[PDB]
Design a binder for this molecule. Structure first.
Ligand SMILES: Nc1ncnc2c1ncn2[C@@H]1O[C@H](COP(=O)(O)OP(=O)(O)O)[C@@H](O)[C@H]1O
Ligand SMILES: Nc1ncnc2c1ncn2[C@@H]1O[C@H](COP(=O)(O)OP(=O)(O)O)[C@@H](O)[C@H]1O
Lengths: 305, 244, 83, 643
C-alpha cells in the first residue's frame, strides 16, 4: 500500500531500436509488456530483465497494449488502422480488428468482460465484440481526435481523454468536463480505496493529466474539479492512482516520475526516471514494481519500498 | 521538338530534375509542345487558372498522378500554395494534400507545370519564392540556326535534305557505337563456349558499320561548307536585325 | 460587311464579343473603337483570339490612342500601325 | 491603473469641466500619450457617461459612425420631429474617436466624415438617408483623440469643424512624470521578492534612461514603425512583474537579466539593420553597468517551455527539447522536415511570448518563405492554440471576408477556443477587410459583422457558452460585453508582409491598429550565420570529406567566424552560402541598369541544397558503378587472355 520507488532501477530491457509507446504489467505472471513504434511488442520478466518473447504482425507503430484480468487474451493496437487480439502464452495473433477511418491512439479491455474499447484518430471511440471483432457501437461528438480511453470498472461509464481540452464521460454522452488550457493527455478511474480519502482531501472520481503542466482530480456528479495538482515541468503522459488509494502516480515529458500525496496537496517524490521523455507508465496490481517506458527506447522497472 | 542549343537544353533538364515545381517563361510557345511531347504517354493535359475547369483538372492530376500543364499564371489562384510547399499528411496507406475545400488523396509522383506567355509579367508575391523559374529565351545561335535551316529549306531542297539525313545518320552511328560498347561491357560482366564468341563477331561486323560513319562525316563536311560559306551575311543580318 | 462596336460600356463589350464570335464563324470584318478604355477587356480579347481558328476574310481591327493603358500582349501579338 | 501627477489631474479636471456641459472635445497628442487613459480616468467622475470607442481608419466613411448608433442607440418620432438617443435611459453615449484627422481628403480638400460630425454638432442632428429626415440628437456628445497634422500620416482639419470642438494638447508625460509613475510601479512590483525592494530606484532610472536614449535616435525619419511612445514602457514593467511573480526569490543579477530580456523583446524587435541592433544591445549593456555598478552572458533567453515556471534557459537543451517537439509535431500535424538553427529558437520564443500575453496580436516583417508561417503554426500548435487562416482564392470579396471572420469570431468567443489567425499580405487588397482588421485589432469587437438574425444566433450561442462558463446573463447587452471579453482574452492574430517601406506606410494609413495593437517583429532575411548553419546541418548526409584539402592564404569569407583552418566541409558550406549571396549582387547590379529582377528567398536555398545532395549522390553512384563495370570487364578479358 505504501509502494513508492527508491533511487536506482535494477534492470531494463534495452532491446529496442524505436521509441516505446506503452508499458503495462501482467496481472498474474511476474512479467511486463511494452509496445514499441517498430510495429512490435516485447514481453519479458521484470524480476530479472531477460527478454522472453515478442508479438509481431502489425505494419506501423504499436501505440498501446494491455491485459485482461489474468493476461491470457491480449489486445494491442497499431496506427495502421489496426487492432489485434493475441494469445499471451502462444504470443500469436488470433484476431485482427479493422473498421476505423484513421490511426488508433489507445486501447483497453474489460478484465473479465467480452468487449474492447478503442480510441481512434477520426474523433471517435469504437466498441467491439471480443469474439467477432465487429464494431457493436460507435461513440462520436468530438471536435479533435481522441488521445485516450478508459472504461468504468463497473462497466457503466466510459471516460474519454480527448484533445478538445476536455475529458468526457459516456453512458454505455453523460457529461463533458473542461478545466485545462492545452491537450488533456491521459485519464484513470479512481479506486474505491481513495473514495473516503478523497472526501478528506476536499463519486465517481476521475484523474486527468494535461499538456498544460497540470493534473486535476474531477468528479462526474458535479462536473467541477475537486483538486488541482500543479508544479509539472512539461506535458503529463500518465495519471494512475495507487492501490492503497492515498497516492497519485504520474509521469510527464520532463524526465521526472512524480508521486503525489493528494491528502495535503504535496509532492511526495520526484524521481529522475530517464534521460529523455517518459512516454508511458504503469504499476503492478500487487507486486512492488512500477514500469516507465521512455523516448530513450527503454523500459525501466523500479522496485517499491 | 526541342531546339538544338544550350539554352533550350538547360531548360529541358530543368524540366526533368526539380524540387519546387517549375515556372517556364515562354515568349514563343515552343515549351508548350516540348512538355506536350515529353509526357505524351502519361496523357498529360493542359489548362489555365482562368479556365473554369481548373479545379477538376487539378483534382484529377493529384488523384491519378497525371501531370498537368498550367498556363496564364499572372492571374494565380493561390489555392495551389500548399502543393508548392510540399505540405501533406499521410494516414497508413493514404497520403493526402490539403486544398482548403478539403484534403484529398494524391499519387506519389505528379508534376504540375506553370507557364507564362508574356515575359514582362510581374508575378504575385506567392510565386516570388514558391517556384523555380525557367527562361525560354532565344539567343543569337538559335536564331542563326533557324535562319540557315529556313533558307536551305526554301532555296536548296537537295542540300537541306542531304544535310538532314546525313546528320541523322551520324547521330545513329555515334549512338550505335556507344550502345554496342555498353553491350560488350554487359556480355563481359570467350574460350568457355561458342555462344559467347558468336555475338562478338557480329559486333566487330558493326565496328565495320562504324567505318560506314567514318565515310559519312566526309560527305556532311561537303554539305556544311557550302551553306556556311554562302550564307554568312544572311544569318548575321537576321540575328543582328532582330536583336536591335 | 464590317461590324462596328465601341468600347467602354459593358453592353458594348458584350456585343463586341458576340460580333467577334460571329465574324470568326462566318469570316467577317469587325472593328472596335477606342479600345484603350478597358485593359481587362484588352487582355480578354487578346488571349481569346490567340487560340481560335478564324475563317478566311475575318479581320479584327482595334483603333486606339497612344498611352500606357494597353497591355504588352496586344502590342506584341497585333500588326501595328501609327497614324 | 492611473498614477496621479500634475498633467493627469489638470487634464482630468478640465475634461470633467468640458464633458459636464456635453461640449464636444478632441485630445491632440502623439499616439500612446495617455489620451485614452486620461479621458477614461476623468470620465469616472461622471457615472452617466457610457463611453464607446470609435476606430477611424484612412478609409473612414460616415457609415462607420452610423452603424455604431444602430448598435448603441435607438431613434423615435417625437411630436417635434425624430430624435436619436442611447438605449440606456438617463445616460449619454460618448463616442470616443481615436484618429479624427486620419481619413484621406477627397480630391477637393474635405473629409466626408469630418463634415458629418460637423453636421451632428452644429445643427444637433443629421439627415437620415432612408427617407431624408432630420434626426436630432438627445443625449450624444462627441469626443475624439488625434495626432498632430505634422505627422506624415495625418492632415489638418477644416476650420469649420475645428471651432465646435475645443482641443486639448496632451503631451507625453516627460522625464519627471515617467520617473514618478514608473518608480511607484517598480516599488510596488519589488515586494513579491522583498530583498529586491531596495533596488526600486536604480532600476527605474535605468528603465527611463535607455528609453530616452531609445526614443531620441530611432525616429520615424528612418522607418514608419518607430513608435517609441511610453505605452510600450507599461509592457516593459509588466513583463518584469510577470517575470518575478511566480519566483518569490531571486538575486539582483536575475532581476537585471529579466530586465535586459524584456528590453530585447521590446527593443530590437522592430529594428531593420544589424548596426542598430548592435547599438541597442551595446546601450542595454552600458546602462546595465551604469545603474548597477548569468545575466552578463550574451545569449539571454527565457522560456515557458522546459520547466513549470518562466525561468532563464540555456541554448543546447532548448534545441534538444525543440527537436523532440519537432518529432511530435511531424507525427501529429504535417510532414514538413524543417531545418532549424540559432534564430529559429529566438523567433519561436517571441511568438510564444506574444501568445502568452493577453491580446497577444503580432506583426511579422521578413522575406517571404523565410519560415514565418511555419514557425507561427508550430508555436500555435505547441501552446494548444488552434490555427485558422484566410482561404484566399479567386472571387473572394468583402462579403466572404466578413463571413469567415464572423464564423471564426463565433468559434473563438462562444467556445472559448484560443484560435490564432494567420493574416497575410495576400488579402490586404480589399480595403474593407483592412478596415475590419483595424477594428478587431482596435477593440476586439467589429461593430457590424453580426447583425439581425445573425445577431440573434450570436446571442443564443453566447447564452449557451456563458451558461457553460458560469456567467448567467439575462440580457443581450451584458452578454455581448462578455463576448467582447472572451474575444479580448482568446484570439491571437498575426500579420505577415515583405519589408517594403511603402507597404508598411500604406498599412499604417489604412489600418493604424496594425501599429498600435500588435507587436511588430523584424524577421528580415536569413543572415549569413543562420544560412551557414542551415547548409552545414542539412549537408551532413553527404560524404563531403577531403582529407588533403589545403586552405589558400586568402579566403572569400561570406560567413563570419569560420575556423582559422576551415575544413573541407566548412569551405564547401561557405561556398553554398556564397552562391546565394551572389544573387543579391546580381539583382542589385541588374536593377541598377534598369532591369527586371525577381526575389531570391530561402526556399531557393532549400532547393539548391536538396539538388546539391541529390546530384552528389547520383554522381558518386554512377562513377562507382562505371568503375565496377570496367573492372569486371577487364577481369574477364584478362582471364580469357590467360586461358
Ligand atoms: N501619466 C502617465 N505616465 C506614464 N504612463 C502613462 C501615463 N498615461 C498613460 N500612460 C501609459 O500609456 C498607455 C496608454 O496610452 P494611450 O495614449 O491611452 O494609447 P492611445 O494611443 O490609444 O491613446 C498605458 O499603457 C499607460 O501605461
Ligand atoms: N526555416 C525553414 N527550414 C526549412 N523549410 C522551411 C523553412 N521555412 C519555410 N520552409 C518551407 O516552406 C514551407 C512553408 O513556408 P512558410 O511557412 O509559408 O514560409 P514563410 O511564412 O516565411 O513564407 C514548408 O513546406 C517548409 O518546408
Amino acid at each position: 500500500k505504501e509502494w513508492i520507488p527508491r533511487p536506482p532501477e535494477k534492470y531494463a530491457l534495452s532491446g529496442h531500436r524505436s521509441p516505446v509507446t506503452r508499458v503495462i504489467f501482467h496481472p498474474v505472471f511476474s512479467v511486463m509488456v511494452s509496445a514499441s513504434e517498430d510495429a512490435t511488442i516485447k514481453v519479458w520478466d521484470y524480476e530479472t530483465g531477460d527478454f522472453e518473447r515478442t508479438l509481431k504482425g502489425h505494419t506501423d507503430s504499436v501505440q498501446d497494449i494491455s491485459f485482461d484480468h489474468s493476461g491470457k487474451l491480449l489486445a494491442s493496437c497499431s496506427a495502421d488502422m489496426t487492432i489485434k487480439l493475441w494469445d499471451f502464452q502462444g504470443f500469436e495473433c488470433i484476431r485482427t480488428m479493422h473498421g476505423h477511418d484513421h490511426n488508433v491512439s489507445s486501447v483497453a479491455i474489460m478484465p473479465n468482460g467480452d468487449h474492447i474499447v478503442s480510441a481512434s484518430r477520426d474523433k471517435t471511440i469504437k466498441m467491439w465484440e471480443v469474439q467477432t471483432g465487429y464494431c457493436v457501437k460507435t461513440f462520436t461528438g468530438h471536435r479533435e481526435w481522441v488521445r485516450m480511453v478508459r472504461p468504468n470498472q463497473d462497466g457503466t461509464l466510459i471516460a474519454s481523454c480527448s484533445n478538445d481540452q476536455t475529458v468526457r464521460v459516456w453512458v454505455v454522452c453523460k457529461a463533458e468536463l473542461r478545466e485545462h488550457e492545452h491537450v488533456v493527455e491521459c485519464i484513470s478511474w479512481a479506486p474505491e480505496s481513495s473514495y473516503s480519502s478523497i472526501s478528506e482531501a476536499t463519486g465517481p472520481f476521475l484523474l486527468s493529466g494535461s499538456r498544460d503542466k497540470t493534473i486535476k482530480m474531477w468528479d462526474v456528479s458535479t462536473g467541477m474539479c475537486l483538486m488541482t495538482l500543479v508544479g509539472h515541468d512539461n506535458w503529463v503522459r500518465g495519471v494512475l492512482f495507487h492501490s492503497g488509494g492515498k497516492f497519485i502516480l504520474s509521469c510527464a515529458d520532463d524526465k521526472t516520475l512524480r508521486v503525489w500525496d493528494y491528502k495535503n496537496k504535496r509532492c511526495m517524490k520526484t524521481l529522475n526516471a530517464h534521460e529523455h521523455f517518459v512516454t508511458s507508465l504503469d504499476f503492478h496490481k500487487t507486486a512492488p514494481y512500477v514500469v516507465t517506458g521512455s523516448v530513450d527506447q527503454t523500459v525501466k522497472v523500479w522496485e517499491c519500498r | 521538338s526541342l531546339p538544338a542549343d544550350d539554352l533550350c537544353t538547360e531548360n529541358a533538364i530543368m524540366l526533368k530534375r526539380f524540387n519546387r515545381y517549375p515556372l517556364i517563361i515562354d515568349p514563343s510557345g515552343q515549351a508548350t509542345e516540348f512538355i506536350m511531347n515529353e509526357y505524351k504517354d502519361r496523357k498529360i493535359t493542359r489548362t489555365s487558372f482562368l479556365d473554369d475547369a481548373f479545379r477538376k483538372n487539378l483534382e484529377s492530376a493529384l488523384r491519378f498522378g497525371n501531370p498537368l500543364l498550367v498556363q496564364d499564371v499572372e492571374s494565380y489562384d493561390p489555392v495551389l500554395n500548399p502543393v508548392l510547399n510540399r505540405e501533406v499528411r499521410r494516414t497508413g496507406g493514404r497520403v493526402l494534400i490539403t486544398l482548403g475545400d478539403q484534403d484529398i488523396d494524391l499519387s506519389p509522383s505528379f508534376v504540375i507545370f506553370l507557364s507564362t506567355r508574356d515575359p514582362t509579367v510581374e508575378f504575385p508575391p506567392d510565386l516570388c519564392s514558391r517556384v523555380t523559374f525557367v527562361n525560354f529565351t532565344v539567343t543569337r545561335s538559335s536564331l542563326q540556326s533557324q535562319c540557315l535551316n529556313e533558307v536551305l529549306k526554301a532555296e536548296r531542297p537537295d542540300v537541306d535534305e542531304k544535310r538532314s539525313d546525313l546528320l541523322k545518320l551520324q547521330g545513329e552511328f555515334q549512338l550505335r557505337l556507344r550502345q554496342l560498347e555498353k553491350s560488350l561491357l554487359q556480355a563481359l560482366n570467350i574460350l568457355d563456349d561458342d555462344t559467347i564468341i558468336t555475338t562478338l563477331e557480329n559486333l566487330k561486323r558493326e565496328a565495320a558499320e562504324v567505318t560506314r560513319k567514318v565515310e559519312e562525316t566526309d560527305i556532311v563536311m561537303q554539305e556544311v561548307e557550302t551553306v556556311s560559306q554562302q550564307y554568312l551575311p544572311l544569318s548575321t543580318a537576321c540575328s543582328s536585325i532582330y536583336f536591335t | 460587311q464590317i461590324t462596328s462596336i465601341a468600347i467602354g460600356s459593358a453592353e458594348g463589350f458584350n456585343q463586341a464579343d458576340k460580333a467577334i464570335n460571329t465574324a470568326v464563324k462566318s469570316g467577317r470584318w469587325v472593328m472596335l473603337k477606342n479600345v484603350h478604355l478597358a485593359p481587362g477587356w484588352l487582355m480578354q480579347l487578346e488571349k481569346k483570339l490567340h487560340s481560335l481558328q478564324p475563317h478566311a476574310c475575318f479581320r479584327l481591327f482595334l483603333t486606339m490612342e497612344i498611352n500606357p493603358k494597353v497591355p504588352v500582349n496586344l502590342l506584341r501579338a497585333g500588326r501595328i500601325f501609327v497614324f | 491603473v492611473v498614477v496621479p501627477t500634475l498633467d493627469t489631474v489638470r487634464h482630468e479636471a478640465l475634461l470633467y469641466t468640458w464633458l459636464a456641459e456635453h461640449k464636444p472635445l478632441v485630445l491632440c497628442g502623439p499616439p500612446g500619450s495617455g489620451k485614452t487613459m486620461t479621458l477614461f480616468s476623468a470620465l469616472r467622475a461622471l457615472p452617466d457617461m457610457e463611453v464607446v470607442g470609435l476606430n477611424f481608419s484612412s478609409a473612414t466613411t460616415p457609415e462607420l459612425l452610423l452603424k455604431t448608433f444602430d448598435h448603441y442607440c435607438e431613434y423615435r418620432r417625437t411630436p417635434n420631429g425624430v430624435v436619436l438617443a442611447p438605449v440606456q435611459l438617463g445616460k449619454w453615449l460618448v463616442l470616443f474617436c481615436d484618429e479624427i484627422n486620419l481619413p484621406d481628403m477627397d480630391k477637393y480638400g474635405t473629409q466626408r466624415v469630418i463634415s458629418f460630425i460637423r453636421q451632428m454638432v452644429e445643427h444637433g442632428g443629421f439627415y437620415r438617408t432612408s427617407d431624408q429626415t432630420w434626426v436630432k440628437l438627445e443625449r450624444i456628445q462627441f469626443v475624439g483623440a488625434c495626432n498632430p497634422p505634422t505627422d506624415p500620416g495625418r492632415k489638418p482639419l477644416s476650420h469649420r469643424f475645428l471651432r465646435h470642438v475645443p482641443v486639448v494638447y496632451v503631451d507625453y508625460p516627460g522625464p519627471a512624470s515617467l520617473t514618478q509613475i514608473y518608480g511607484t510601479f517598480n516599488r510596488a512590483m519589488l515586494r513579491l521578492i522583498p530583498s529586491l525592494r531596495t533596488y526600486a530606484e536604480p532600476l527605474t532610472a535605468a528603465m527611463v534612461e535607455f528609453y530616452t536614449m531609445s526614443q531620441e535616435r530611432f525616429t520615424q525619419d528612418t522607418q514608419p514603425h518607430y513608435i517609441y511612445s511610453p505605452r510600450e514602457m507599461t509592457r516593459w514593467v509588466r513583463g518584469i512583474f510577470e517575470a518575478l511573480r511566480p519566483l518569490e526569490t531571486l538575486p539582483v543579477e536575475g532581476l537585471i537579466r529579466i530586465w535586459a530580456h524584456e528590453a530585447l523583446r521590446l527593443f530590437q524587435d522592430r529594428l531593420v539593420e544589424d548596426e542598430e541592433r548592435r547599438w541597442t544591445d551595446e546601450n542595454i549593456d552600458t546602462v546595465a553597468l551604469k545603474h548597477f555598478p548569468k545575466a552578463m552572458s550574451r545569449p539571454i533567453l527565457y522560456s515557458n517551455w522546459l520547466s513549470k515556471d518562466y525561468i532563464p534557459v540555456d541554448q543546447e537543451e532548448l534545441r534538444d527539447y525543440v527537436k523532440a517537439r519537432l518529432k511530435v509535431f511531424y507525427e501529429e500535424e504535417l510532414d514538413v522536415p524543417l531545418v532549424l538553427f540559432n534564430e529559429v529558437l529566438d523567433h519561436v520564443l517571441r511568438i510564444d511570448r506574444i501568445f502568452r500575453q493577453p491580446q497577444g496580436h503580432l506583426l511579422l516583417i521578413g522575406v517571404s518563405g523565410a519560415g514565418k508561417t511555419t514557425l507561427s503554426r508550430f508555436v500555435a500548435w505547441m501552446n494548444g492554440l488552434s490555427v485558422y487562416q484566410i482561404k484566399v482564392h479567386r472571387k473572394y470579396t468583402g462579403e466572404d471576408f466578413d463571413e469567415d471572420l464572423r464564423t471564426v469570431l463565433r468559434r473563438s468567443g462562444c467556445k472559448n477556443e484560443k484560435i490564432a489567425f494567420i493574416m497575410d499580405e495576400s488579402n490586404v487588397l480589399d480595403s474593407g477587410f483592412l478596415e475590419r482588421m483595424n477594428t478587431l485589432l482596435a477593440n476586439g469587437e467589429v461593430p457590424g459583422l453580426f447583425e439581425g438574425d445573425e445577431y440573434a444566433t450570436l446571442m443564443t450561442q453566447c447564452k449557451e457558452g456563458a451558461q457553460k462558463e458560469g456567467l448567467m446573463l439575462d440580457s443581450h447587452e451584458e452578454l455581448y460585453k462578455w463576448f467582447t471579453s472572451q474575444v479580448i482574452r482568446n484570439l491571437h492574430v498575426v500579420f505577415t508582409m515583405n519589408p517594403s517601406s511603402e507597404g508598411l506606410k500604406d498599412r499604417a494609413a489604412t489600418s493604424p491598429a496594425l501599429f498600435n495593437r500588435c507587436v511588430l517583429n523584424w524577421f528580415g532575411d536569413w543572415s549569413t550565420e543562420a544560412l551557414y548553419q542551415v547548409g552545414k546541418e542539412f549537408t551532413s548526409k553527404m560524404d563531403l570529406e577531403k582529407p588533403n584539402y589545403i586552405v589558400p592564404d586568402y579566403m572569400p569569407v561570406v560567413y563570419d567566424k569560420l575556423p582559422q583552418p576551415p575544413s573541407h566541409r566548412e569551405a564547401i558550406v561557405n561556398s553554398c552560402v556564397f552562391v546565394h549571396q551572389t544573387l543579391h549582387q546580381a539583382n542589385a547590379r541588374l536593377a541598377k541598369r534598369g532591369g527586371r529582377t525577381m526575389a531570391i528567398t530561402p526556399r531557393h536555398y532549400l532547393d539548391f541544397i536538396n539538388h546539391y545532395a541529390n546530384l552528389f549522390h547520383e554522381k558518386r553512384s554512377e562513377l562507382e558503378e562505371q568503375q565496377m563495370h570496367l573492372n569486371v570487364g577487364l577481369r574477364k578479358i584478362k582471364e580469357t587472355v590467360d586461358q
